[PDB]
């Protein structure tokens, strides 16, 4: 199971390296990635790319042999042999790619992370925190799995507190937001 994940996350950065299109590793994968460790195995991979490139994305599919299940607002899954590809897209915006709706360094272009002894591009720990606090705002964290809940606590005290704090005072000063324009439309 370990294995073939990470073989598969490895073949999937061969064929984007190949396509040429940048890939930002995401998540609990990411923060493994980031701590050099694949502590825990995830049957969902989580890896975001460029949203403008969707057409070489399928062609990657196709090529893992895996088909693409359904493309959604916030990204398309795929599902690649047994295993589930969770795709983000990434906005290319001021010379940038950033996660949708996340903070600025949502992706860094530098090598976060190490994946099999690969260096790999990896989401920001505030990109995966904002992820992680967006879900608990979905699903309440006593709802939320061992896994979730025990990636989103590595990656906060990788963080630190404070930073950690700042980024939740913002994303729920975001949801206020929304949910008054919502309120007000």
Same mark, same amino acid.
């Given at each position: 199971? #370990?294995? $073939?994940?990470? $073989? ?8 984007? #390296?190949?396509? /040429? ?17 694949? +502590? ?7 890896? +975001? ?22 493309? &959604? ?10 295993? &589930? ?37 990896? /989401? ?18 006593? #709802? ?12 906060? +005290? ?28």
């Amino acid at each position: 199971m #370990d294995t $073939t994940q990470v $073989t598969l996350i490895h073949k999937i950065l061969a064929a984007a #390296d190949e396509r /040429n299109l940048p890939l930002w590793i995401g998540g609990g994968w990411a923060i493994d990635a980031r701590l050099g460790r694949v +502590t825990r195995k995830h049957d969902d991979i989580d890896l +975001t790319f460029p949203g403008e490139r969707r057409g070489e994305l399928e062609a990657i599919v196709e090529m893992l042999g895996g088909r693409v299940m359904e493309e &959604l607002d916030y990204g398309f899954l795929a599902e690649i042999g047994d295993e &589930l590809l969770d795709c983000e897209p990434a906005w290319w915006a001021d010379e940038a790619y950033e996660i949708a709706e996340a903070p600025q360094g949502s992706c860094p272009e530098a090598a976060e992370g190490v994946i099999a002894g690969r260096p790999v591009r990896c /989401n920001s720990w505030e990109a995966i925190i904002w992820d992680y606090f967006y879900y608990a705002d979905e699903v309440p964290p006593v #709802d939320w799995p061992t896994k979730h809940i025990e990636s989103y606590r590595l990656a906060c +005290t990788s963080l630190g507190a404070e930073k950690v704090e700042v980024l939740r005072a913002a994303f729920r000063s975001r949801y206020a937001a929304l949910e008054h324009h919502h309120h007000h439309h």
